[PDB]
Each structure stands twice: as structure tokens, then as C-alpha cells.
Amino acid sequence: GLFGAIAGFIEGGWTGMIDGWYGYHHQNEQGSGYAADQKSTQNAINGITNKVNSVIEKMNIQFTAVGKEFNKLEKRMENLNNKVDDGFLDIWTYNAELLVLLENERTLDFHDSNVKNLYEKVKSQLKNNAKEIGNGCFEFYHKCDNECMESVRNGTYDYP
Amino acid sequence: GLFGAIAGFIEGGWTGMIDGWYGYHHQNEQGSGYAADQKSTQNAINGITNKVNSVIEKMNIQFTAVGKEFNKLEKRMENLNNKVDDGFLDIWTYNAELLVLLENERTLDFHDSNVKNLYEKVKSQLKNNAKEIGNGCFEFYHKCDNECMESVRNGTYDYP
Amino acid sequence: GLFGAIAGFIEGGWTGMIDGWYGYHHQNEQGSGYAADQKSTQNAINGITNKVNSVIEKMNIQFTAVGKEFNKLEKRMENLNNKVDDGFLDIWTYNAELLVLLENERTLDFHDSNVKNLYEKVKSQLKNNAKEIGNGCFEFYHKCDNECMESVRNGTYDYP
Amino acid sequence: DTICIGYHANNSTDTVDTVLEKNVTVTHSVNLLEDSHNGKLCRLKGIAPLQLGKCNIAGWLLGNPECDPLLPVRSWSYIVETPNSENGICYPGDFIDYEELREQLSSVSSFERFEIFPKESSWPNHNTNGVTAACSHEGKSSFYRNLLWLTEKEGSYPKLKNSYVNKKGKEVLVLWGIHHPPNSKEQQNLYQNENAYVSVVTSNYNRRFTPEIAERPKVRDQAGRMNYYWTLLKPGDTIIFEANGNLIAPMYAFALRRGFGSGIITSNASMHECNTKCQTPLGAINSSLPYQNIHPVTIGECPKYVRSAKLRMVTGLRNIPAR
Amino acid sequence: DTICIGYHANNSTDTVDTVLEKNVTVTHSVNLLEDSHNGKLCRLKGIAPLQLGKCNIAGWLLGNPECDPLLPVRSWSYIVETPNSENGICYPGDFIDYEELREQLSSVSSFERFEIFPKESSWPNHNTNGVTAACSHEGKSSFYRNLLWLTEKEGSYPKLKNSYVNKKGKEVLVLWGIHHPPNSKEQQNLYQNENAYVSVVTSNYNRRFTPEIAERPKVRDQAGRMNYYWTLLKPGDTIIFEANGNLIAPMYAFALRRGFGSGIITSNASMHECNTKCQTPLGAINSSLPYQNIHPVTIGECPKYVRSAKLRMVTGLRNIPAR
Amino acid sequence: DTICIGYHANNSTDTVDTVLEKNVTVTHSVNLLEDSHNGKLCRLKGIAPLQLGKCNIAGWLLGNPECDPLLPVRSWSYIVETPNSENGICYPGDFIDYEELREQLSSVSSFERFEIFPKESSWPNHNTNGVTAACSHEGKSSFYRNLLWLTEKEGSYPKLKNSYVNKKGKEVLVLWGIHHPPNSKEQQNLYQNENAYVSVVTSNYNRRFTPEIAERPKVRDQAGRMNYYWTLLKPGDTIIFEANGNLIAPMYAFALRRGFGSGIITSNASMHECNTKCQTPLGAINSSLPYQNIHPVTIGECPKYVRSAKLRMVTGLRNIPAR
Ligand SMILES: CC(=O)N[C@@H]1[C@@H](O)[C@H](O)[C@@H](CO)O[C@H]1O
Ligand SMILES: CC(=O)N[C@@H]1[C@@H](O)[C@H](O)[C@@H](CO)O[C@H]1O
Ligand SMILES: CC(=O)N[C@@H]1[C@@H](O)[C@H](O)[C@@H](CO)O[C@H]1O
């Protein structure tokens, strides 16, 4: 990963999450459970949705394109027509394949970045009230409620 | 942002800083005020300037291009010419629009990255001589003048 | 650099390194020295090698392309042929030059990123068993063996 | 009490290519390449195409006896020829500017076939039963449905001159032919005059035709030849035919209506009662995807043809089930 | 004592699009799309264009009486036709290879109109006052200024042969016509010879013309027709005209000088005393921007035309005043 | 004790450009732009090209006496003309559809030159020794090797009618000419018949030629003219020549074999005993790089031509020796 998070200091994903792409897990006495961070997952959705729609939109509709006939004494013209169709086809095939290859890389790195930033947003929130354990996880020192685990998932959380 | 600084752990910008893109605000019992980081701002200016110039330079001037006439028995040649002109027009419109959309994204990330690294630059200097507070800000432990604030700006300040 | 490592907090490269692109230096009493990280360097080689092969693969071979003659009364056809050849040539020259410029940028950031991630990978292990000094460097608080400096390289070393 | 920060994962096996790595399994992705089509030729926005079948544009427009089933068709959304469209010209000869004529029909949405020169009343002093075994129908010598073979009458071929003023309010496609006997005896026998000529003129068309007599290799068992010509008579204009032999006169002409989006395609697929917005020679397409790798020939509103085998855009992320 | 790290912000309302997000307000950006123009036709590098006005290339080169104001113009930077350029050929007929001639003139930077065959001494044995109502001037029957209608003199039209050796050191564009009477009656009292011909030859040009007489619909009240032809006479070569009727002889010819960057455009904009490096049919452009969405037709050194309505690159950062 | 994390550096001076910075020194890089070749003309996959030398396609196919060295060549990989390929037609005239003939030859991999009409037994009643100073060899008047100038014999020029059935199982290219005397006296002395004509027909070709007599500027000291024509006789078809004058008859024809990848190029480079997969007019290329800036004209499998002066992709990183 470009930002070190995904497939990085956070070895794998959670098949247990089904509310989004990014989220959390808690180890309280009231129980455990996964929860997606709507904020970051939504932004990620609006952006990727915009990316796919931009790619689709730039490729406006292809109107009627047909072949043409040339008599036996029009071989040069027939070959010019051939050079034109093949030349454009080469360019469009090239553009499409490159655009997809390049954006996919950009997209994967995008997610990696979101996870990294989400992790940091939490780390800077908790500060000294917890330690960084198995990468991605945090062990609270004061132990805190479910209503408090929420304060963490929502950016609030009050105490150093 | 891809790097988490702009519109990230540094909520907003300073309409008060007019000497550059990235900088510092100071708070002393000598006074307050803003100061742009020439080093960073300039390097970002060189980069963006070369980028825009590259985009412009790659589109070397369009020389004389006009329409062509065809008699009533040259419909196929007329349509061929039409296909050629439309085809090239579609490709350049596509190329121009795509190139701008993709580079604009990269440019914004560029700035984000610049703010992140400048921050990490200062953080690593004020190692243990202050603490991280309102994100982007640092509260000194020993209280330091105006000259010392400058030692932070020009990358010096060599205190454990 | 985009990630701040190369030419960043790690001012320069090591001419002494001749095993890979990213590595470490020994500073204990059993002698100094350099050691390249096979994991990182290799993964980086797989990616960059794939990138170059993609660029090359996308540009299939140009088959026979030759000029054409036109009689004195086929000036419009001759100019059309000319517009087609120049048109395609402009696009491919533009494509080739843009792709290389943009990917070169990406490649350099990729390395910057790999140095950053490897730096953080180490900085997350040592943790308290040493401090960060000359940027990229860590002074072991407990002082350890050559065999030990190896624990760090092979990603082991799990001490608080 | 521990809170962890993580990312989604699932059982998806979707794969996409990136610049640094190929076949990367991801959680969610979207296909941008349409590879599925109907077979089947369909109506285009409710309008059926013209299926020439065993006939080609030439056989259709000249009225080759084996294309009669096409005589009534008046409108279409596109034209379809098949690999078996062999029935075109039936009497050997050259069809001048045939390719351009095809291009013209490519923007025609419909027309009315009408009698420009009625068989009975237009040629009082000439025979019109001229028929040939090269253009047979039901095993009997016949002739083009839209043309008339004019020949000598009672040992005489009076210089003829016929006009037709276009009052259709549209361009009228007129076709005709010039017959070339293989020898002087035939020329004399069929047209009386040895040095005949044909003249066809309008406000913007002016051509003269001279018989070129010589022995030639037999084609469809004919040493003779017939050259075919055509013009577009503008609204309100007049066309004048003048000749003293060799004229294969127009009997039916076509009042043309222009449209957009049509074209001529070659296909061996079958016509069914389906409707589409996008047709290719292999089958119809119903899709919103930006690209397609089905066929470069398209009628209507279609995705852009590309040679790509796969174009998939990753939306989700690297999928690491961590099983 | 506190020290913060922050970024610039302002009141800029500039917006740009990106792959992930549209209309993003930024502090600094640059427009790369030129959309402003003069609304006028200008001089190109100090040289004015040839404004044919109510005339077209044909009217200009043949010398249509209605195009006399153009007769003296010798050089130009580009040629401008207008939607109302109707005055071309005044006597009905076909202008052979007209489009190609237009293409030739497209690379001509200037020429000298000169008498190739002085009216006074070139045709001692033929009348040269032939005139027509189809080419009237000042409500009076007239004729092309660059051609001469030769007719029978004193009941006779002797076979003529005239030559011209190109010593201008430049290609010489020669134009001429072939008249086609509507009936042999007229053919004979204009040219005497019922069976006439015209021959025009040079070292690389060789063509013969035969009158084709026939009743034709009246165009510009003429049942007759006049076809026009041209050829380029290489430096030093000789062109020979020979005929016994129907020749519409050349009187003036043009010694051509070739240049680069010219062309023919159609515009309804007016000529003003302005100078530009880039001209379009809508107006002149003065810009250094890479793209323009003004018009696809351009003369000079212009920005590349694209269909885009907007192309703006962000230079500054995301604008967050946080007011 | 200390452990540092760092990156590789070296003495490399390679530079590459990026979007943000130009000439960035890197450690490892790869060139993608091929700029080398051997200024030689080579065999293409073992097969040598046809070098026309001082001759051009016209000279070669008509059999211009100055192109005898080419007579035996039966196959090639590509065709090569030089800036000094002047020897085309030697007797002035027009080579009809010459450009299309060149296009036809560009896909011919080989042919067999054979006698379609043996000189000794084809024209029993006509003289075949016709010769001209315009087509001289060894300082003596001669004629095209593949054509025969037929003229009157014993004050007579009988109407000739010869045929040839294509039993070669391949397309046969037939070439011929029509001579045009400058005056009737010459027409009479050479062909006897004042109103001669030539006719050429096949199953799909049909043209008649009429001598057009007129005084003309001398080219290669000839006021006369000779026009050349050609056609492709389909396998099994028959071609018939019929004439009573002016025919420059076919003697040798060409049974053609089609291939792929061939073409005509213009070069002043010399042929050498080298082999290549990619040939350009400047020299041969042996490379695997995606692009080349050597020449746009290519024969074989070559890198894509681009106007770039440099295309270097960085693989290693920013080089900082820190000395
Ligand atoms: C974003 C959201 O779900 N809203 C809750 C809010 O109602 C609650 O008061 C606060 C502290 O518990 O945490 C937020 O997450
Ligand atoms: C679509 C295509 O490849 N064309 C073939 C066609 O050549 C063949 O005559 C026909 C026989 O049914 O089958 C079609 O599929
Ligand atoms: C200003 C600039 O960056 N361009 C120079 C170029 O003029 C020079 O030819 C090349 C090699 O010496 O080095 C580049 O850096």
C-alpha cells in the first residue's frame, strides 16, 4: 500500500463488517461488535462514484458508424479509409485500457489513505488514555462505555 | 485530502496569511501574527508552474485548418473528411478534459502533502519542548521569544 | 517528495548500498556496514517492472506504413491523407510524452513511499528500545549485537 | 476494552489490473465493457430495417425480377445486405458511380416508387416488350421492373424525346441504361440507326451516350452490355431524355425523403420482432456501459467499440479476507 | 507561547472539477480555454484577406461582371466567402474540377492577372463581341472579363490555332469554356460548323472537347450550357488552343505565386483595420492559451479547438476561509 | 548502537522529466525511444527488396529500355524508388490511373512476366518493328520491351482482333498504349485509316479509344503522344483487343501473386547483405522499444514513430550521492 494502512500495519480486512469500507471494533464488557464509520465511508463513496461517472461521461455515445464500398479503381481511398478507422480504434482502445489501469491504482491508494487517516484521527483523539497494540487497535487505560465507544467513532470523546 | 492535513487535522485556512501557501502563525507575549514559509511555498510554486507550462507546451500551436468542398458525386469522400475531423475533435476534447481533471486532483493532493510534511518537519523539531494541541499548533514548554520562533521557521532550533 | 522521506527527513542516499534500493546501516561495535531490505526492494522491483511492461505492451507494433502518391488533380485527397497522418502523429507523440512524464512522477513518489513505510515499520518495533536522531536513524538505548541488528531487518524483534 | 480501526472484506473474487500489479482481487468493482448482444436484427426505435436478402442495392433499385418482394417496402431504419446478396445487375455491364448511389441511399429514410414514364402512353412509336434471359423470372425471359427496353417498331426507331417535371416536392432518383450491341447487325436490327445516341439532361446534369459496339466475352450468356446511370432530379426541375436508339428508359423513379442515423450493414443474423436503440451486424445491444467489444459497425446510439477483452474499474478495495 | 502550521485562504470564488469532486473552490487557478474573440475579420500579419463578398471563387476567376471590384486585387493572406456568395458562373453549365481549383487557390499568396490572348490581335478572323443576358452588367447584356466568346465572322468560322509560351517564371492558371448550343440551328449560325471540336494541349495536359447539342431546361433563361475548364501551365511550357467553333477563349490568365498558411473561410463578419495572428470565421483571437472553443476553422497560429465549455487548472489550494 | 534506514544512490547521471520537475537525475532508467539504425537497405526476413534504381514503376512495368536489369526479377519483399528514379515512360503521354497501379503493386509479392501476344505469330498482317528515338537504347532508337508498336504493312492496316484467355490461375495485369499522331498526314502514313479506333474488353472492363490528332508542344522531341492503360484480367476471363490503328499492343503481361506487408518507399540508402524485421528509408532497425523517432515510413514490424527527441522512463529513484 502507498499509505501503509491496508495490507500494511493492518494485515487484513474484516469480513465481519457490512456497513461500509472503513470502521471499528470494540472490546468492552458490554460485548463486542463491528461498526462502520459513515463519515469516511460516505465521502469515499461520493468520490469513487464521481470518478466512475466522470469516466463514463467523457465517453459520450457512439452514433451510427458503418463501412463503405470502393470500386476497383479506388484502392488508395479504400486504404485511407482503412487507415482512419484502424488509427482511431488503436487510440480509443489505448486510452480506455490506460485510463482504467491508472485509475484503479489511484483508487486502491485512495482507500489505503482513508484508513490511514481514520486511524490517525482516533489516535490523536485518545492520546494517553490508551496504548497502540496490535496495529489498528487501541487498549483503553480507563476502560469506557458503549456510549463512550461511540464518542470515539464520532469524533467527540472528551479526556486526554 | 490524501495526506490528512488540509481540511483534515488542520480544519481551515488563514485568510490572514498572504505571503504564501504554507506558513505559521505565532503567539508570543510580544505579539501575534502570520508568517509564510518561503522555502515550502516557493518549491510548490516551481512545481505547479512547471506543471501548467508542461500542459501548455504539449499542445503546440494549431496552424491553418479550414473546411473542404466536394461535388455532388463525392459524398463518400465528404463523409470520410467529416469522420476524420470529428474523430480528432473527440480525441482532443477528451484528452484536454481528462488531463485537467486528473491533474487538478493531483495538484490538490500536492498541497495537502506539502502541508503535512511541513507540519511533520516542525513536530520533529519541537520534539520534546512542547506538546501538540489544536492540531497544527504547538504549545511551548519553556516559552520562547520572537527570535526563537524564527529559529523554528528557518528549520533550526536544535533543542532535545 | 510527496511522502517526505527521500530528499526529506532522510537527506541523501547511500553509495555504500549496492544490494537494493532501500536498506540499513550497522553502527554497533562489531563494525558498521550496509544491508538492503530484500522484501521492500523486491516488491518495488515487481511493481516498477510491471509498470514499464504495461507501457511497452500498450504500444503494439507498428506494421507497414508508407506514403502514397496522388495525381495533380487529387490535391484535396492528398491533403486529407496529410491531415490524417499528421493528426495521428500529433496524438501519439502527445500520448507518449504525457504518459512518461506522469508515470515518472508516480514512480518517484512510489519510492518515497517505500522509504517512508519501511522507516515507520522499524520505528514501530523499536518503540521504547531506542530514540530517533539523525532522521532515518535510531540510537538503541540497550545497545545490541550484529545478530540482533538482524532481528530488526527481518521484521522480528518484538520488544516494548 | 479495545477499539480497533479496520476495513471491509468479503468473498468477492473480482479482479482488476493496476499499473504496478495485475489480477488484484477486490471487494467491489464495475464493468465498463459491454460484451453481450441480442444475435437477432431488431427494429430501431420501432422501425424495421430493409432486408435486401439475396439482393443488393443495385438489384433493388433497378428492379431485378428476383427482388420483387422488395417492391412494396417504403421506409426503413437501416439497410441490411447478406453475404448471399448476389442478385444485383442481371444484364452484364457497368453501374456508373454505384458506390456513391449506395452512400446516397444511406441517408434515405423512405421513398415512394412511382411511374415517371408509364409503359402505356410514354412510348407510342416504340416497342417496349424487350425482354432478356439474363433477367429471367419463373424460368421465362423477363426484365427490370423499373426500366423499359425500347426497340424498333415496324422497322423504324423514331427519334424520341420525353420530359418529366418533378412536382413531388422532393429529390427524385432516376435510373436508366444504355444498351451496347456486340455487333452492327444487332444495332441495326434493334434500333434501325447505326449511329445512335442518348441524351439525358436536367438543370444540373448533362450527359451524352454513344453505343460502343464490339465483340465481348459472354457474361450471363450475353456478349452485349448494358451500362447503368442515375441522377437526383431536384424539386421542380425537369429531366429530358432524347434518343434514337440504345436507351433503356426509366419506367419507375423514387421520390426520396432524407433522415439521420441510417446506414448499410452486412449481416447473416436474422430479423426478429425485437426493438433496440443500438444494432450491430452480430446482434442488438441494450446497455449503458461506455465501451463494447462486440463489433465496430453500429447503428443508433451505442457504446464505443474497442478491441479490449476486459475493462473493469475497481470501486471497493483490496480484498483480504484474512481466512 | 504557541506556534501553528497552517495554509493560505482567501475570498476567491474560482472553482474547478476533479476526478473525485466537482466544483471545488480554490484560492488560485488558471484558465486554459480561450473563449473570447474580436467579432471581426482582420489582417493576418499586416496582410488583408480577399473578400469576395457577393461572389465566389468561380465568379472571381472567370471574371463575372458582378465581381469587377475584385479585378485589381493581387495579394491576400486568406480568402473569405460569405453565406451570400451567389455570383459565380453566370452562364449555366459545369465548372470542371472546381473543388480542386479552390484547393489550388488555397495555397496562392498572390498573382498577376495578365492578357494571355489580347482581344485586339488574337483572333483576326473571328467575332469577339459575343455577349449574353445571363451575364448582364448595368442592366445590359455582357460577358466574363477573363474570357472571350468567339463566333463566326462574315458567315465563316475558320479553324483557329493560337499558342502562348509561359515566360512568367511561374505557374500560369489558364481558364476557358466550351459552349453547347441547345440545337444544331444555333450551333451553325454561331459557329458555322455543324461538327466542331476544341483541342487544348500543353506538355502535360491533353484534352479534346466535342459540342453536345440538345434541348435543355432553361437555367438563368438559357437552354444552352457552357462548361468551364482550367489547367496549370508550367514555367516555360506552351499551351495551344485549336478549334473550329464552340470555344470560349481565355483572354486573361493568372501567374501564380505560392505561399503557406492561407485558406478559404466562410464568414459573415466584417473586415476592420485590425491585425491578428489568428483568425476564425467569427472573429480574430489574441491568446496564448492552449485551447479555444470559439470555432474549428482557423487561419494562422491558433489555440487548439475543443468542444469543452470549461478548462481550468487549479494552482492554489482548496479554499477554506472558515469564516 | 544505531541503525539507520536509507535508500540507494550511485554515480548514474541519467535524467528524466516529470510533471513537477525537469531533468531529474535518477539511479536507474530505461529508454523507450529507438534512435538508431544502420543507414542501409536490408532484406526483409531473408527476402530482398526490388530496387528500381534510376527507374520508376512506369518504366519497370512498361519495359522502358533503360530498365532491362529489372526484367528477370520475379519476387521481392518491398519496392524501392530513389530520388533519381526518372526513367518512367519514354514516349510522352499520360499513364491513366497510374497512382492506383502503384497501389496495386504494393501488395504484390511476386509475378511471372510472360508473352501474352508473341511478337512473331500474333500480328501476321501488321508491321511490329516500330521504334522511337524517345525510347533509345545503346544510342539507337528502340521501344518498350513489354509493348509492340503496330503499324501499316504494304500500305494497309487490317482491322485486328486478338484475344488471350487467362489460364494462369491468377490475376494478369495487362498494359497497352494508344498512340496519338500530331497531324492527319502522320495518322495516314502510320495506320492508313483516318478514323481509327481501339477497343479493349474483358468480362468486367470495357473501353474504346479514339485518336485525338492535334499539334502539340514537343516533349522528348515528340509532338506525338502515347497514353497508357492497364487492367486486371481475372483468372479464367478473356481480354479482347480490336483495332484498325493507333494501338500500342501488349506483348508481355504479368501473372500476379498477392502478399502482405509490402509497399513502395523512396530512399537514397544502399542495399547490403543484412537482414531485418523493420526497414525505413534511412536504414534498418533492430529494436524492442515501443517507439522510434527515425522515420514515419516503415516496412515490417516496427516501433511506433513519434516526434519525440527523448522518452526515458525512470525505474530507480532520485539519485543523491551526497558527496
Ligand atoms: C454522529 C452521531 O451518531 N451522533 C452522536 C451524537 O448524537 C452523540 O451525542 C455523540 C456523543 O455520544 O456522538 C455522536 O456520534
Ligand atoms: C457472423 C459470422 O462469423 N459469419 C458467419 C457467415 O460467414 C456464415 O456464412 C454463416 C453460416 O450460418 O454463419 C455466420 O456466423
Ligand atoms: C532549462 C532546461 O531544463 N532545459 C535544459 C535543456 O536546455 C538542455 O538542452 C538539457 C541538456 O543539457 O538540459 C535541460 O535541463
UniProtKB/TrEMBL annotation, chains D, E, F:
Disulphide bonds in the chain: C42-C274, C55-C67, C90-C135, C278-C302
Top-level division of the source organism's lineage: Viruses
This protein's name: Hemagglutinin HA1 chain
Organism: Influenza A virus (A/Mongolia/153/88(H1N1))
